Amino acid sequence: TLNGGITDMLTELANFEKNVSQAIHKYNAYRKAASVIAKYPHKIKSGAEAKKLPGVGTKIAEKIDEFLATGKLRKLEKIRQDDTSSSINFLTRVSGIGPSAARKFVDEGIKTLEDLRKNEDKLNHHQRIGLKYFGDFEKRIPREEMLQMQDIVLNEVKKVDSEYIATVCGSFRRGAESSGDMDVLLTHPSFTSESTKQPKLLHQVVEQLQKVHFITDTLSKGETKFMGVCQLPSKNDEKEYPHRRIDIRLIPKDQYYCGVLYFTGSDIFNKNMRAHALEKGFTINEYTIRPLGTGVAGEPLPVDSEKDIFDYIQWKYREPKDRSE
DNA sequence: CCGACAGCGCATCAGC
DNA sequence: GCTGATGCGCG
DNA sequence: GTCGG
Ligand SMILES: [Mg+2]
Ligand SMILES: [Mg+2]
């Protein structure tokens, strides 16, 4: 964090554009600049220096000059003073409340944590759970807790069917000392790109984790994606652990490597990599990498490892720990 | 200049 | 009921 | 907001 002040500024601007302006490309532009600067191994002395980096243009360079000179940004000072913008930004911190819902709520005079709490009947299911655990979902998860959680999930999955493979991805797989949530990539040989030889593959696993009181709430749930809440058990007389977000993704077994590449991230790494794929004439999703013809995706290319995907787009392989962008 | 910017699962809603 | 659009979320 | 062509 040699350039922590700058990257914080850019992230705050990114969030303003996403939550308030609803200008998603400006949001992505700011997050790309923040990311490229985050990994720059020198303490930035000027906007001109920063503009040399890809993703940092004239506008951001000027803001960097203002920040370096004064230690702040007037544009952000104003955004902070603005009540509507401040309220909208806050409400979007609740899982399930996006830019649209946030603005609608502020319109109806619902703009604080207290307001949400007394207008629970105006929230959908996801939003109600997000509100319920607002504080807990703010907290990071120490890797030590992530390991305990992995143990529980892997063992319980094995108890349902020894043929399941569960893999913890996200920041955890990238080696992070703390994670925002737990991401689990699930496979079973009965579910491939060719056929689904049995139903409820995800359900069975979700049910088992609920049975042992690990999964506590469900935000959303389909045939291949679960989004919910979980909690480590605590010992006698011990304060309870915070509730944690958990995502579970069931991926066709023969598409494991594209799946694990996707779920490992980071999000910015994925966007950079998929963008590069397009430049190289390929399209990548969590299932396949395909060639682009007219500009139409052709058939899935053969993939036997994460590295095969990197090879297709002519990138040297990067270990998970080097994908934290 | 200006087109493009990654890709997709689940929930909700409008329109039929 | 279904379809398509839109919101929100995941990396 | 930034970039490539
Ligand atoms: Mg995560
Ligand atoms: Mg997650």
Unique bound compounds:
magnesium ion
Counted beta strands: 9
Order of strands in the sheet with the most strands? 2-4-7-6-5
Radius of gyration over all CA atoms, rounded:
22 Å
The profile of the biggest β sheet is: 5 strands, mixed
CATH class of the largest domain: Alpha Beta
Structural class: alpha+beta
Number of helical stretches of at least 4 residues:
16
Cofactor: Mg(2+)
Family: Belongs to the DNA polymerase type-X family.
Main location: nucleus
Subcellular location: Nucleus; Cytoplasm
What keyword list fits this structure?
monomer, alpha+beta, Beta Polymerase, domain 2, 49% helix, DNA-binding, lyase, DNA polymerase beta
In short:
Its EC number is 2.7.7.7, 4.2.99.-, 4.2.99.18. With 325 residues, the protein is an alpha+beta fold.
